[PDB]
Each structure stands twice: as C-alpha cells, then as structure tokens.
Design a protein around this nucleic acid. Structure first.
Length: 1657
RNA sequence: UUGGUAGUACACUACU
RNA sequence: GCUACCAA
C-alpha cells in the first residue's frame, strides 16, 4: 500500500506522542499522506504526470507560452493537476472522502474563479473532481466530458494501512478531551466516553432476543451494526445514519406516495357533529349508565346539592354569643310535635341549657382560655372537669357533655346510628361476587323539574336584599382601586354584597371556620356549638380527618329558608320555627374550601359578568353559588366532559357521538347536578346550531377582525344571554377549574389506577402479540418507516448543533458529582427494596397497642397476617431522595465520581426494577431514577433543537410560538390565495354569465386547525421503537449504547408493587378464588407485584416519547405535501408537539377539489401517521376548527392570544403553606401575577389581591376589629401606611405589584418619600441622583408614620418577621436520621460536626462536590427545627386550623427578632409583639446615614428596582386608546464567575484548591468591605461571647450562615427565566416592556402610551 | 425499649 | 401520637 519507511515513521510518532497537539499533527499528516498516495496511484492509471500542487499561472504559461504573466491577472488557486487536450483545459483535484461536500466547495470555487480567464483566452475550462471513497474504493467524477476521455479508470488501491494507523492514534488519545476538540471538524464534536467497557449481557437478554427475532434479517444486521458503530473512529459521524436511511428509502418513499394518493380516494364525508350525533350519543350514554348505576326517580334519595341550610338574620334579637347560646338551647327544647328525632334534639338543648347563669358561664370560659393562652405548648397533666351550670355540663366555651341523665339511651342510639350515621351496612348480597352506586335519574322529566324548582326557589330567596351594610374587608380596603380600574366592576361588587347570596355564603364560610375550630378538641362524649355573625344560624358539631355536623336555622315563617336539598325537617317551636339539616360527614379539606368560597364565588360572578350587559347578575349568582359550594364528585363528573362535549359539537370535524356514548358518565347525586346535566345537554345542541358563527366562512383584515373586534352573537351556556367567542370559551373551560383536588378518597383513587394499569397489562398479555406492522395494527410500529424517519430527524437535529454531546453534559451536570444535582438530592419520595419484616412487624404490634388503648378509653357504647398469606412478597419502604443517596454513599454503592459514569455502572448493576404509587404518578427506586436521567436528558437536549417539539420549550415559550405560527399562517393563506388568483382577478375587474365562469376556476383557501389528544400515551406505546432511537444516535459510544439498551431491556421486565392497602381489603374478604383483576394478576394474592412490560410508566419517558411524536408529524407533513402537489396546489403545515398533546395546523390553496374531501383525507392520514409510529390519536377528544388553536390549555383566536386566566384567580384563594401573614400573602399574590401576564384586566386583578389579603388575615385573626389587628398598635391612620411585614395592606401601582410582588410595598413607599423630600430643583432627576440628595434631609421633619416605616426597614427588613413557631417529627424511615441520632448520643459528636462546618462554612449554604461534605451537611440539617418539620407530610386543612387556634397563644420568638438590633422568657403573642416592637424602636433612632443604607440595599443593589423606580418617576402618559390586537412579549432581563459552592470555599483565600477564580474572588471581597461584613460579625461574635464569658458555637453558626448566605445569593447568577405577557403592543426592549406594563394595567376599558423624560437603565 | 398509672387545652365572639 | 409519675 503506502511507503514503508513512511509507515514506520508514523508508527514511531504515534508511540512517542504525548500531546493532543502532536497527535493532531499526525492526523493531518496521515490525511495528507493518504491524499498524496491516492493521487500518485491515480496518475499512474491515467498515465499522466503526477503533480502535488500546481500554481494556475504555470498552467497558463504551459498551454499559452505567448501569454503575458504580468497582464493576465490569473486566479490564485492551486489545483492538484491538469490536462490540456483538444483545446480544453481540464482542472483536476483529488479527494479521499466518503462525502461529496468537499468536492462541491472545491468545484464552486474553481469554476467561479476560472470564468473571467476562460472568456478572455477563449479556452473552455472544465473543473474535474476525482474522488475516491476510502471505504468502498469506488471512484466518483462529476465531469461528464472527462469520463469520455477516461471511460475506464482502474485504481487497485488499498487504504488498510492508513486505517490501522488512524485507529491506533485514536485509541491512544480517545480519552484526551483536547484531542477530540482538535481532530473533530467541524459540525460534529464528541467528548470522552462515559465508560470503558460495554455490556455483553445485553446481547443475551431474552427481551433483546425477542426484539431481534421480531425483525427481518436485514434489520437485525443493521441494528447490531448500528450499536457497534461509533462516530469517533469513523470517517464521518453520519455514515451509519446515511447508510440505514438509504437502505429504507424505497419502502419509505412508497409509503409517502401510497398515502398521498389516498387524497383521490376521499369520499369527503368525515366524522362531523350534528343534532343526531348528539342524540344518539346521549342515548348510548344512558344505556351504559344504567348498567353501571342504580337509577332512582325518587326525591328522597337526593343528596345535598350544598351542605348547608340558611336563613336571614333577626335584627330584633341580640348578637351576643351567650344570648345566642341560650336562644338555641330553648329553641331546641321548645320543639313541638312528635317525630323520630325530636326527643333527642330536645335532649341536646337541655344539655346546653345554662339558664340565667350567663355571667358564670363567661367567667368560667375566660378562665380556661387564659390558662391555655398562658403556654406556647398545650396544657399538660391537668384534667378538664366539666362544670355544672344549670342543666349544662360545660367542659369548655361551647362544649357540652353528653349527659345521660338528660336523654334516654334508646333515643341517644337513634341519634348516632341513624341520624349521624355513626356505626351502622346492609349487605343484602346473594353470591360471593354479585350493589351499584346510586344516582338520580337526570333524564327523568319530574326529577329535572324538581331540580328546576330548587334553583327557582333559591333565586326568590337569595336575590332579595340582605338588609345589611354592604361594607366588608374587600369593599372597604380595595374598593377605591377597583373603582378607578373600572367603575362597572365596583358597581357589580355592590350588587352582590347587597343580596342574600353574599350574606348566605359569607355566613357559611364564617360558621365553617368555626365548625372546624370547634371540632379540633371535641371529644367522643361531648358535642359543640358553632355560631356566626348571623344570629339565626348555628351548627351542632357531633362527637367523633372528618367533621360531623348539622346546621340549625331559626326563622319566623316556616318555608322562608334556603334549602339546597339538605333539609332534614322544619319544626314549630315557641317563638317561630326551627329547621335542622341532615347530619353532614365532610372531610376537613372540603370544609376548608367552603371557608374560602366567598372568594371563589365573588371571583366567579364578576368574571362571568365582566363587561357583558346582556347577562343578569341574579342568574349568574344563582349558578355561581352552587359551583362554589357544591363541592362534590357530582359536579366533577360534569365540568370535565363539558369541555369536550360542547367543543366537539361546534367543531368542523370531531366525534360527539362516541365521546358522550363512551366517556361521559354523570354522577348526578344532587338536584343541582341534574339541573347542570341539562345545561350541558342544551349547550351541545345550542353549540351546533351556532357552529357556522364560530367557524369562519370564506373570509387579512376580514380574518383578524373576527377575533380582535369580537361581537356578541353566541348563546350563553349556564344562564340566559348572549356572549362573545372569548366569553363563550371561558364559560366552557373555566368550570373545570372550580373543582377541588382530592374529592375522591385515598383508597379509591389508588384502586381505580391500579385496576386500569393491570387491566391494560392483562389485555396485552392475551391479545397484543405483534410489535411491527404495515397496516397500522393496534399497538404496533411500522418498522422501516420508523427507522428511516429517525435517521432523517437524527441527522437534521444533530446537524444544527455541533457540540451537542457537550451541551448535554454541561446543562445536565453529567461530569459533576451526583451530590451537586438538585433532583438527586431532593426531598421527594423514593423507593427501596429489602428485608424490613422485623421493623414493620414491630410497628404492626406497637400500632395495634396504641389503637386498643385509645379504643378502650371510651365512655360510650394486620401486617403480620399479610406476609403469612403471601409467599412471594417483595418487601419495601418509601424514603426520601437525599436519604437514599446518603445510605448508598454510606455503603459505598455510590460515590462522588462524575454522575454519568455511575449511571453507566448502575445500568449494568441494577437488573430488577420496581415501582409503586404515592403515599410523575409513580414512585421508583433511586437506581431507576439514575438510569432514566441519562436517557431523558439526552432526549431533552435534542428536543430543544427539534423545532416542533415543545415539551422542551422553556417557560411560557409556547404561547408566543403559537402566535408566531398563526400569524405566519394567516399571511400564507392570504398572499398565496392572492397570487394564485392574480390573473383571474385581473380578467374579472377588467370587465354576469362570463364573470361567473372565471370566478369558479379560481383557487380556494382551506385552513384547518387540529387540536389533538393522544390516547393511553404511555400505557400502550411500543417501547421497542426507542431501541432504535438509542442505537442510531451518533453522539453515543457502543459501550454507552450497550448499557443503555440493557437497561431498557430490564425496564420491560419491571414490576409494579401493589400497596398493602389494596391487598388487605381483598384478603379480608377472600373466602375462595376471586376474579378481581388485582387478585387475578397476583396469582390469587400470592404476590404483591405484577410484571408491567409494554406500559412504560406515565412521566418517565416524556422527552423520548415526545421526540418520536415529532418524527411522526414530519412524515405527516411529507404526505400532505406530496398529496397537494398532485393537485398543483400550495400548502403550509405546522406541527406543535408536547407528549400526548398535539396541535397541527394546515393551510392549503388549490383549485381542483372540494375542501370537504381534503379534510376527510387530511384526518385519516393524521390518524394513520400516529399509528404507524405506535401512537393512538384520540378522536373522541381530538377536534378540528379553522380559527381556534388549542395547545396545552393555551389558545390562539384568529391570530390573537387567549388564556383562561380565571383558573389562576380561583387558585389565588387556597394556595399557601400556612406559615405566616407575609409568606401566605406572597404565595396567594403570585397567582394574581400569573393571571396578569395571561391577560387579566386591571380591576379583576385587584379583586384577586383583595381576596388574597382577606383569606390571609382571616387565617391569623388579623381582620379589622379582630384581636391581632395591628392598626391601633402602630403610628398609622390607614392600613396602607402600616408595613406589609406586619400584615399591613399592600399599597402600590398594579404594574409594580405584577413585576416584583410584595416587595413593591416598600419600594413604592420609598418612592413616595423621594417625591416628597428631595429638593424642588432635583425632582426631575433620575433615581440615583435623588438618592444622593438624601444627605440633605431633615429627619425631624418626617412624620411619625414615615420614621416608623423607615426604622422597620433599617433594623428588621435588611436580611418576613412575624412568623409563628409550632411545637410539632416521626422520621423513623430515614437512614440518615438514625445516623444523626447516633451522633447526638456520641460524647463529642455534635460539637465535632459544628466545628467541621465552621471550618468549611461553604457547607452551611451549599453542598460540596465531595461525598463527606454532602454526608456531613445532611446530618447538620437535622439540627434545624424547621427542616425536620418539612420531611413529614402535613394536611393543609390541619395547617390552616392549627394557625387559627394558636392565634392567641404566644407563638412569636421575639428574642430571635430583638437581638438583631442591640449594641424575656420564651415566646410572645402577636399583640404583645407589636407592643414590644414599638417600644424598642422608640429607643432606637434614625439618622440620615440609616436612610441611605435603606435605599442602597433595596434600590441601588438591584438594577431591576432602579429601572422600575425610574419608570415611575420619569414617566409621563399619552392619551388613552382602545385595546385592539394583543401580542405576546417575553419579559426582558434587567440584571447584568463559577460554581458558588467552590467560589465560597475559595473565600476561606486560595483560588487554587485558574486565575479567573481569583477574578471572582477579588470583587467578592469588594462587596464585603464596602458594606463592611467581615469586620462586622467578627465584632458581633466577640461581643456575644464576652457577655457570656464562654464560646457560643450556636451563635457563631447562625452568624456565619447568614454571612455566607448573603454571599451565596450574591455570587449565583439566576438563569433568565422565560415568561410571556399578553400586551397591547410588542415589546422590543426593556424600555418597551416597562412602558407597556405601566400603561396596560390602569384602566379596563383603555390603555395608555408611556414615555420617559430621561434615561432609565 | 418494655410494662403500669394518670391526663392530653381552644378560634369566632360580629351593623346581623 | 404527645405529656407527667412509677417499675423493670
């Protein structure tokens, strides 16, 4: 082959090389040698003279000696060789390449540059590129004329020696990162392998053998060939892809064409909504429902539409608590007549009859309260003895003993067993496996009329004036701003607040708050009494998670009550009537929503009514009060399907028939549900009849006006009136968001989920046999089409970023320690398998002991078993992520080597996988999490490159993309139709019988929007298809592929673990063989596991699956395009993909076919496209329009963006962790912020903000006149002037609130001061200038309020403040906690660890890359009280009520607050904290320097706060204008290093442990010494210990922590988040965004232009 | 840890 | 579950 001396030299250089530099040079020399070697052998075959390089002037001098080299101006190119024959100049170049790319550039360059000289000399110059493929050895020559001179070229040439040399060089430097960078060139770069060896076990894996045998022989070879391929060692990175693509090209192209030709087979009759479709669907629905339910036509089977009866108040009587107590007692005893429970009721009134001894009652109660309020903790070891007060046995305020002297045992029993339903079961069952749930007959005539009268009656009663002042918190504290935003909404509030509706719901809320408060400490042998501001309504809280209660209403006329279907009986008493509701057993989470309901109801009504004069508020309220309060499964079964039913009904193409027939399953237990089912039914019919008004006709300015200039011509759904399209959509989609979470029980959501999973698995085992098919067989993939489409997409996507593998590694921290990755160190749940029999069986015993004790303590009248019955029980426990990492680190299973390297190892080591449900809906092992991390993050990055894949799109990016696509599509439709008819239009407008002939022949536009949904995405996918996605991937090495595929093989052998909960119930009633799917699939409860093969579990492979989804839509695009060119038309196809969400947009212009046939064609190919890739498009849900896009609950209407922003407003009432006034309010406010960027109008945002305040204050009894109300305790004559940190009212422009939330409260206050106290001459200056002028301020001139505020800002805010502490862990399952306990018990353990952390203070804020660092930082965490509390799951209802009940107890650690400004035993009450705060401030004065420090930490430290400050000062507003055409704009960056963890270590002073580390460190030190800190805490430490006379290791830790936490939040750069705002115009800069925001959020009806007087940022 | 004895604590309170 | 006392 090559020269031998030359060969041995290369072999010496390779052996000697120690540098990427040296090795790189060898690579170049090998290539250049190989190129020369070819040329020499090539020239020998052509029998011409060999020349390595030849100047072009020499070519001329040779063929034209008479030409003047000084005047010819020859090009500056150097061809390898040439040949002048027959007056034709052949320019030659040799290439050794498997690709033609080098040749194209060489040709284009040479050809272009030889044109000038060709024309001058009259010499034809032919450019000849002679290439040889070094693999096949085939020659390729472009020049047809050169092949005529050499029609037979033979080059017996062998490149084997060059391949061996290259291979030896590359093997030696394979791990050299620098080598890969230099060698790689230049559209593809790799990194070092993640592992050395592959996985031989893969090739023997039965599941691989299954995957193999299922393919034809060629595809087997190609798969094994593709796995063993690696781009690093190959000529090009894409050879494998290209090879496999070309092999499958024939069958692919035939599929595209065969499918495209189907356009001519379309009948044009596609699935389509109409009267009959709806009717027949409904018919089939009723049939199915009857099989599955027990239908009743009887009203007495009715369930409560609302868990509440109500009556108006009585101004004739007193509203004193004690008065009301007696009033009820007497009213109960004076019940007249005989009925089943009247004797018990009278007895109850007797048991709370304190007679006239009210003063005794009060003082007894206040005595008990004072005691309880004396302690932060609960009172212990002091028995509560009931006091005798008249006939009543009083245990506590409004708690009464169940006195057996005052009630017959026979009557008492009826009350519990039958009325309360406590301890009763009627098993009228015939076989072992025979009792269906009962519902009302929604389609019965009279049953409907029954529901209608309830709605009618409730309107007659609640519409009436409540006869109260409308005044309330929302109105008094936010009415002003709401009115200025929009007077209409202000008026609408009053309309509501004046009615019985508002009072009724407000009463239910207050009473429920009190019911819950009261239920907490209620005992098994006591009842309790709840009251509210309405002196006619009460609640009896019956003895015992849940509350059992009955509402009691006092009223004058007997039928004058609001009875939403839960009245038990109305009774005549002494001075009128008394009504009692059925006993209600309601879980406390529902109860908490009831408390919140006034917010929901107000929000709902104002929303539905907003800006619509056709709607009657009365009608709105009657509907809204039920949706707000009917917190039931009944309504849930209606609001979900309503979206699909109604939308399908008005769609171009859809399937109402099937959706209603199969999936609509009403649970009409209440009358309201029956009433609502009807509204939905009519909605569908009404929807179809106005279908043509929604869907656009044949139409640029005619299209956009429809959505922008939205006129009100559609029929309203839930109440009489007319409605715009937007408003129409809100009525359809909003109701789903009324629904509460967890309306289903614990046991019942699991069981349903378990059964579906198991059923699907069982179906597959017995029917699903095939993996591949060409006819879209159920749950199959078209093999060759998958392969070809993957190659094509893998090529296109990989080409648009050359450093992809690097991107993956860096963005997902593959190279870094596992201990530095959030998701691998989280507090999420995780699963581990092992032997925990003893632990659990001991707990089984200990649990039953505590059960019987409490069960024995009654003045009233099993794991071990499981594991004896189950031979194959896979034992397990659920721990936390960080805890499992600790354990594995501790047992040296894991290490702190790069995470990706351990993942690779884990893919071989973990052979058996397990998953289960929660205590991402599946919990997996930590090991499972590691493996899938690699696969999904690889996919993640390539999804980001793929332009159609959107699950990878960061932030709010989707809403902006939808808009860009739809504005691109309106353009295409318009311009394309205008250009196709330019000539027809000209002939027409030039000139009625001959105009008509021409107007038919013109092209018609077709726009269709496919809003699609995929079916059983994860449960019925063809998981095998992803094997190719891995094998074909060029960025993966063979060793990496082998391990990944071995994992995926194992993954298809994974097992689901059935929670013991499911297994008990079945064993409990297992007398013999049973057919329940759970027992069936467990070999009759032999195992607690089931093998789950084909179902990859929901949430685990989203990116991977979403990438293939994109591939399926790329085939779809090609089919539609080919189909339309057969009609010589134009087409634009766009597709947006998001796991099981798909929005595909088609725009067509053609003149040979009716649109109905194109629609019919397009949908069938959509269905087929999904199926060929193993996806099942769901046509019950999938619907088609020509104007409305829907994608992941985002809309685009005729080009304009649209969102159901209401859903965020409804969640702004319940979302908080219940920690404190400031935190809770912050949490609730962020929902209003979200709604704003989603298009919420100004006035409705304020209502949300108002409600948020109310709920927050309500939680801590801080409302006006309430105990913890701080107004009187501070220098302020208005809530707006009291700080936000002390639960003051928020005061700031809405534009500012939107951008920076609660922190705007202070920021605005500081801005008011600048506007007031800077000199008259400086007022028009920027912020920085006005802050400098603070040194010329007079503190003495400031008002008391202003100094109070400033003092708080200075000494408290710098580095939330009034946060209650709780006495509370139950952390037995945490491995790391047990170790923390070993260290507590160890003699010097903890001090040793505290010491270690002070030495490495980096660990106080971060977690080091080191293992030891991590393990020791975790043990440390446990020393924190608040951390340990986080690990235990907490019921939000219990968090809510605990906060209420402890409101008067001392829960403020003021000593923790006070110490921070110095240079008392235990806890304190809220109210006492206020007082202590004021006192301290009085003796702590405020200087001009202090005020500057305030401005510098708040304003000047944040570029955002500077900008926002300037925007408010320097702005001036232009005249108002309408809102027309809203646009999506991304929020720009305002703010302008290395890993914070290491940077902080360097600080404690060696940038070593590059130079840039010092660069970081230098300006970290500047931040320190300017606002001195290093010297501040050193002094602060020295003081504390000198006072104590001994070292205080705790205080030193606290100080250090905050010192370094300040540094941690200074160093770390925040990655700019993508958040998109709907605005009146487009924002192109930071200046635009502020002006628009500032100008868009002031008035509902109009918006303003905002200009500025000076520079801003 | 086991066994025994005795307990297990609090809001609304309102123009109505 | 938590608390106080007692016994091992």
């Amino acid at each position: 082959g090559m020269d031998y001396q030359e060969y041995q030299q290369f072999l010496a250089r390779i052996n000697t090389a120690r540098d990427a530099c040296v090795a790189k040079d060898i690579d170049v020399d090998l290539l250049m040698a190989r190129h020369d070697y070819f040329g020499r052998e090539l020239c020998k075959s052509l029998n011409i003279e060999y020349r390595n390089d030849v100047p072009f002037i020499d070519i001329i001098l040779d063929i034209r000696p008479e030409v003047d080299p000084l005047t010819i101006d020859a090009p500056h190119i150097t061809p390898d060789n040439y040949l002048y024959i027959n007056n034709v100049l052949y320019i030659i170049d040799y290439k050794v390449s498997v690709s033609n790319e080098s040749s194209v550039i060489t040709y284009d360059k040479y050809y272009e540059l030889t044109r000038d000289i060709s024309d001058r000399l009259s010499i034809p110059i032919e450019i000849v590129i002679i290439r040889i493929d070094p693999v096949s050895r085939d020659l390729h020559i472009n020049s047809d004329r050169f092949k005529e001179l050499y029609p037979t070229i033979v080059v017996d040439i062998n490149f084997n020696q060059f391949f061996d040399l290259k291979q030896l060089l590359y093997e030696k430097f394979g791990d050299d990162e620098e080598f890969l960078l230099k060698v790689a060139h230049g559209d593809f770069t790799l990194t070092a392998p993640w592992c050395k060896t592959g996985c031989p076990e893969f090739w023997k894996h039965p599941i691989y053998k299954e995957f193999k045998m299922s393919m034809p022989v060629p595809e087997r070879r190609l798969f094994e060939e593709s796995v063993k391929f690696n781009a690093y060692e190959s000529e090009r990175w894409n050879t494998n892809l290209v090879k496999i693509r070309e092999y499958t090209k024939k069958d692919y192209s035939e599929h595209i064409s065969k499918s495209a030709k189907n356009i001519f087979l379309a009948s044009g009759f596609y699935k389509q909504p109409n009267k009959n479709e709806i009717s027949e669907g409904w018919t089939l629905m009723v049939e199915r429902v009857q099989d599955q339910r027990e239908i009743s036509k009887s009203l007495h089977d009715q369930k409560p539409s609302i868990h509440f009866i109500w009556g108006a108040h009585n101004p004739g009587n007193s509203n004193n608590a004690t008065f009301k107590l007696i009033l009820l007692s007497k009213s109960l005893q004076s019940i007249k007549g005989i009925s089943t429970y009247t004797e018990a009721f009278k007895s109850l009134g007797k048991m709370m009859d304190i007679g006239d001894k009210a003063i005794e009652y009060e003082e007894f109660c206040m005595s008990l309260k004072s005691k309880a309020r004396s302690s932060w903790k609960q009172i212990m070891n002091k028995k509560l003895e009931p006091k005798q007060i008249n006939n009543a046995l009083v245990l506590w305020e409004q708690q009464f003993m169940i006195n057996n002297d005052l009630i017959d045992k026979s009557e008492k029993l009826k009350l519990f067993k039958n009325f309360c339903g406590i301890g009763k079961k009627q098993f009228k069952n015939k076989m072992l496996e025979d009792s269906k749930p009962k519902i009302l007959d929604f389609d019965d005539a009279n049953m409907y009329l029954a529901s209608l009268t309830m709605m009618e009656q409730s309107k007659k009663i609640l519409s009436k004036s409540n006869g109260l002042k409308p005044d309330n918190f929302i109105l008094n504290e936010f009415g002003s701003r709401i009115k200025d935003a929009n007077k209409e909404t202000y008026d609408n509030m009053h309309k509501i607040f004046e009615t019985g509706y508002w009072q009724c719901i407000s009463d239910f809320s207050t009473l429920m708050k009190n019911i819950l408060s009261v239920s907490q400490y209620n005992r098994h042998n006591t009842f309790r009494i709840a009251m509210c501001a309405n002196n006619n309504v009460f609640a009896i809280v019956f003895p015992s998670a849940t509350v059992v209660y009955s509402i009691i209403v006092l009223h004058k006329e007997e039928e004058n009550i609001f009875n939403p279907g839960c009245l038990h009986g109305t009774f005549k008493c002494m001075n009128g009537y008394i009504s009692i509701s059925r006993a209600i057993r309601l879980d406390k989470e529902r109860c908490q929503r009831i408390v919140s309901s006034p917010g929901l109801f107000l929000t709902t009504c104002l929303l539905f009514k907003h800006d619509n004069p056709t709607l009657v508020m009365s009608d709105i309220m009657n509907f809204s009060i039920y949706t707000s309060l009917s917190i039931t499964k009944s309504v849930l079964s209606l609001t979900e399907p309503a979206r699909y039913m109604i939308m399908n009904s008005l769609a171009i193409s859809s399937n109402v028939k099937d959706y209603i027939a199969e999936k609509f399953s009403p649970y009409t237990k209440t009358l309201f549900s029956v009433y609502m089912t009807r509204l939905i039914k009519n909605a569908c019919f009404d929807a179809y009849d106005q279908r043509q008004r929604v869907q656009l006709r044949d139409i640029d300015y005619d299209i956009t006006q429809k959505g922008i200039k939205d006129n009100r011509e559609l029929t309203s759904i839930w109440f009489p009136g007319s409605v715009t399209l937007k408003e129409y959509l809100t009525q359809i989609y909003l109701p789903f968001y009324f629904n509460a979470k967890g309306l289903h029980e614990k046991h019942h959501v699991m069981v349903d989920l378990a059964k579906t999973i198991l059923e699907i698995e069982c179906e597959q085992r017995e029917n699903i046999k095939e993996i591949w098919s060409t006819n879209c067989t159920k749950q199959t993939v078209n093999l060759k089409i998958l392969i070809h489409s993957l190659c094509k997409n893998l090529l296109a996507d990989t080409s648009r970023h050359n450093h992809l593998r690097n991107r993956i590694e860096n963005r997902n921290n593959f190279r870094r320690s596992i201990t530095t990755i959030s998701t691998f160190t989280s507090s999420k749940s995780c699963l581990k398998i092992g032997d925990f029999r003893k632990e659990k069986e001991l707990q089984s015993v200990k649990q039953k002991k505590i059960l019987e004790v409490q069960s024995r303590k009654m003045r009233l009248a099993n794991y071990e078993m499981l594991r004896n019955a189950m031979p194959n029980y896979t034992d397990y426990i659920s721990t936390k992520v960080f805890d499992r990492l600790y354990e594995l680190l501790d047992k040296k299973v894991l290490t702190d080597k790069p995470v990706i390297e351990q993942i690779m190892d884990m893919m071989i080591d973990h052979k058996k996988f397990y998953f289960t449900f929660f205590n991402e809906i599946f919990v997996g092992e930590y090991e499972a999490k590691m493996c899938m991390y690699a696969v999904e993050r690889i996919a993640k990055e390539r999804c980001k490159l793929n332009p159609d894949e959107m699950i990878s799109e960061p932030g709010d990016g989707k809403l902006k993309v939808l808009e860009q696509k739809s504005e691109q599509e309106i353009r295409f439709l318009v311009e394309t139709t205008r250009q196709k008819n330019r000539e027809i239009d000209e002939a027409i407008e030039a000139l009625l019988g001959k105009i008509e002939k021409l107007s038919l022949g013109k092209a018609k536009g077709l726009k269709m929007e496919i809003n699609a949904d995929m079916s059983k995405w994860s449960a019925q996918d063809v998981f095998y298809k992803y094997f190719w996605l891995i094998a074909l991937d060029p960025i993966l090495y063979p060793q990496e592929k082998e391990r990944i595929l071995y994992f995926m093989c194992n993954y298809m052998d994974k097992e689901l673990i059935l929670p013991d909960e499911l297994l008990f119930n079945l064993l409990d009633q297992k007398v013999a063989y049973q057919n329940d799917i759970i027992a069936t699939m467990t070999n009759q409860l032999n195992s607690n596991t089931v093998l789950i093969k084909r179902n990859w579990l929901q949430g685990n492979f989203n990116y991977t699956s979403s990438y293939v989804h994109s591939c399926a839509m790329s085939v779809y695009k090609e089919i539609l395009k080919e189909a339309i060119t057969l009609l010589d038309g134009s087409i634009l196809v766009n597709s947006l993909v998001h796991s099981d969400d798909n929005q595909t947009s088609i725009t067509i212009v053609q003149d040979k076919m009716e649109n109905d046939k194109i629609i019919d064609f397009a949908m069938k190919e959509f269905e087929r496209a999904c199926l060929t890739f193993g996806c099942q498009a769901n046509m019950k849900k999938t619907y088609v329009t020509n104007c409305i896009k829907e994608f992941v609950s985002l809309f685009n209407l005729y080009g304009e963006p649209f969102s159901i922003y209401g859903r965020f407003l409804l969640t702004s009432v319940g979302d908080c962790a219940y920690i404190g006034p400031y935190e809770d309010l912050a949490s609730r406010i962020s929902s209003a912020q979200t709604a704003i960027k989603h298009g919420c109008p100004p006035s409705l945002a304020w209502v949300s903000i108002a409600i948020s305040h109310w709920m927050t204050s309500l939680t801590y009894n801080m409302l006006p006149g309430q105990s913890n109300d701080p107004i009187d305790y501070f220098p302020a004559e208005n809530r707006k002037d009291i700080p936000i940190e002390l639960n003051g009212v928020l005061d700031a422009p809405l534009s500012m609130i939107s951008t920076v939330g609660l922190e705007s409260g202070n920021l605005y206050f500081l801005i008011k001061l600048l506007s007031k106290y800077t000199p008259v001459m400086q007022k028009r200056e920027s912020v920085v200038n006005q802050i400098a002028e603070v040194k010329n301020w007079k503190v003495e001139d400031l008002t008391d309020n202003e100094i109070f505020r400033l003092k708080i800002l200075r000494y408290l805010v710098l580095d939330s403040i009034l946060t209650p502490r709780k006495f509370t862990g139950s952390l037995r399952k945490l491995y790391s906690f047990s170790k923390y306990q070993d260290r507590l018990s160890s003699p010097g353990g903890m001090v040793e660890l505290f010491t270690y952390l002070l030495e490495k203070p980096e660990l106080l804020v971060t977690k080091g890359e080191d293992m030891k660092d991590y393990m020791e930082s975790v043990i440390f965490r446990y020393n924190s009280k608040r951390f340990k509390e986080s690990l235990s799951i907490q019921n939000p209802a219990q968090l809510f009520i605990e906060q209420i009940l402890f409101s008067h107890k001392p829960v403020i650690d003021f000593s923790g607050i006070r110490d921070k400004y110095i240079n008392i035993l235990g806890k304190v009450t809220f109210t006492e904290a206020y007082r202590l705060l004021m006192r301290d401030l009085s003796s702590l004065e405020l200087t001009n320097d202090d005020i500057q420090v305030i401005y510098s930490y708040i304003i000047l430290n944040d570029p955002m706060m500077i900008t926002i400050a300037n925007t408010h000062i320097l702005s001036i507003y232009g005249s108002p204008q309408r809102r027309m055409g809203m646009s999506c704009s991304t929020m720009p960056e305002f703010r302008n290093h290395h890993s914070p963890a290491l940077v902080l270590r360097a600080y404690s002073n060696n940038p070593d442990i590059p130079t840039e580390m010092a660069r970081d460190l230098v300006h970290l030190k500047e931040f320190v010494e300017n606002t001195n800190l290093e010297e501040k805490m050193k002094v602060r430490i020295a003081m504390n210990e000198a006072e104590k006379g001994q070292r205080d290791i705790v205080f030193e830790l606290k100080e250090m922590t905050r010192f370094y936490q300040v540094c941690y939040e200074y160093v770390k750069s925040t990655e700019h988040k993508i958040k998109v705002f709907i605005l009146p115009a487009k924002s192109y800069t930071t200046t635009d965004f502020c002006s628009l925001m500032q100008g868009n959020l002031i008035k509902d009806k109009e918006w303003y232009t905002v200009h500025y007087l000076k520079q801003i940022l």
